[PDB]
Amino acid sequence: VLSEGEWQLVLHVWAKVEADVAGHGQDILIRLFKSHPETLEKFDRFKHLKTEAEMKASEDLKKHGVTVLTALGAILKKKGHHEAELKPLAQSHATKHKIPIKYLEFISEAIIHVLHSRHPGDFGADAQGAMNKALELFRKDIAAKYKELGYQG
C-alpha cells in the first residue's frame, strides 16, 4: 500500500502528464514498440508501422495513446480503490487481447522512462519510487484477476 505522501507524489506528476496527454501517450507507446518489438504484434491496428517516423506520423496511434493514459489516470486517481475500473480492463486484456502480465511490466518501464524525460524537476528519485510502487500495485491487482480467469502468464 502506498502512503498518502507517496500518492501525492504520484498525482502531482500525473497532473503534469495531463497537460499533454496525447504527446505523452505517443512517446510511451513508441518506446514500448521499439524496446519490445513483440508487443507491436499484439496490435492488428498498428502492425503495419515499421519505423519510428511512421509511428510518430500516425494519428490513430496518438488517439490510442490518449485512450491508454486516460484509463490509467482514472485508476491512479482512485488511490488503490480501483476495483470497478480495473476489472473490465483485466478481463479484456486477458481474454480478448491476450496480453501477458510481462507486457504490463514493459509498458510500466516505458511510462517511467517517459516521465523522466519530460519532467526531471517533478520526477526525482522519490517520485520515481512512488510511481513504481503505484504501477506494481496496478500489476499485482491485474495479475490476481488473470489467475482467477486462468491466464496467470
- Binding-site residues for heme b, in ranges, read 93
Residue 45 or 81: the one with the smaller Cβ distance to ligand COH is 45
Segment near ligand COH (CB under 6 A), from 14-22, 77-85, 86-94, 120-128?
86-94
Helices (H), 18-100: 21-35, 52-57, 59-76, 83-91
CB of 145 within 8 A of CB of 86?
yes
Segment near ligand COH (CB under 6 A), from 8-16, 55-63, 95-103, 121-129?
95-103
| Listed residue (135, 116, 133, 114) closest to 6, CA to CA | 133
If one asks whether residue 3 binds ligand COH (CB under 6 A), the answer comes out as no
Least distance (Å) from ligand COH to the CB of residue 41? 9
Using the rule CB under 6 A, which residue among 86, 99, 127, 131 binds ligand COH? 99
CB of 7 within 8 A of CB of 76?
no
Residue 15 or 71: the one with the smaller Cβ distance to ligand COH is 71
Place of cell 523522466: 116
Distance CA 92, CA 105 (A): 17
Using the rule CB under 6 A, which residue among 67, 95, 117, 152 binds ligand COH? 67
Using DSSP's 3-state secondary structure scheme, residue 153 falls into: coil
Distance CA 19, CA 153 (A): 35
Binding site for ligand COH (CB under 6 A): 39, 42-43, 45, 67-68, 71-72, 89, 92-93, 97, 99, 103-104, 107
